[PDB]
Design a protein around this ligand. Structure first.
Ligand SMILES: *C(=O)c1ccc(NC(=N)N)cc1
Ligand SMILES: [Ca+2]
Length: 223
């Protein structure tokens, strides 16, 4: 997250770190046994880390649970990033509490202008590299579909939305992908892609979770 703020320990209780020896992506806990992330975060050997603040220090609220299965969306296209969503099942259910909690799936799609909370452990620089150890946060509005398409001609599908600031300076970045975009207490987005980070006229692009609720529910019900 570039141009954000330190969230505070365990203030984003649905935020997970995906670890394969190191943090590589975010995710969102949607019930005691399932995490939503980005398909482009797929790999083998995922351990889900819940209750994290500093990802380099054991601070006492962590739960580390290996994945039993991963399900990339049937129609994920890694070239266009259309349908950039995956489900990860935990081998055992998390113990839910005030610091490790699920986030609800949307009932309705969110509209341009709605404020959202974007979070992660990704790079905090637009130019160069600095990875924080503690979780960062950014409040950002959803942008109009028209603004989004004008920023990324030919690239925005019906399964994507933009959020952030056309002036740049405040955005998600590498290492944040797969993590949450939460608006009015619902998971509306997954941190997906953009050109660089925090660049003018290149806001973040997010997987539009409301389009996937039926797939998510059906997949969980049979796996
Ligand atoms: C994921 O790691 C990711 C998502 C989005 C961006 N770019 C922007 N938000 N502009 C970079 C990396
Ligand atoms: Ca920790």
């Amino acid at each position: 997250i570039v141009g954000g703020y330190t969230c505070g320990a365990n203030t984003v209780p649905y935020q997970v770190s995906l670890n394969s020896g190191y943090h590589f992506c975010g995710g969102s806990l949607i019930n005691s046994q399932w995490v939503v992330s980005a398909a482009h975060c797929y790999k083998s050997g995922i351990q889900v880390r819940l209750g994290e603040d500093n990802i380099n220090v054991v601070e006492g609220n962590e739960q580390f649970i290996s994945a039993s299965k991963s399900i990339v969306h049937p129609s994920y296209n890694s070239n266009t990033l259309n349908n950039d969503i995956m489900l990860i099942k935990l081998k055992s259910a998390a113990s839910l509490n005030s610091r490790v909690a699920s986030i609800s799936l949307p009932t309705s799609c969110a509209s341009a202008g709605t404020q959202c909370l974007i979070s992660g452990w990704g790079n905090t620089k637009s130019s160069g590299t600095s990875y924080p150890d503690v979780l960062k946060c950014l409040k950002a509005p959803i942008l109009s579909d028209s603004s989004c398409k004008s920023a990324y001609p030919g690239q925005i599908t019906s399964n994507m939305f933009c959020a952030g600031y056309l002036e740049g300076g405040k955005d998600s970045c590498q290492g944040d992908s797969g993590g949450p975009v939460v608006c009015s207490g619902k998971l509306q987005g997954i941190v997906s892609w953009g050109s660089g980070c925090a660049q003018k006229n290149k806001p973040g692009v997010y997987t539009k979770v409301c389009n996937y609720v039926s797939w998510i529910k059906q997949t969980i019900a049979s796996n």
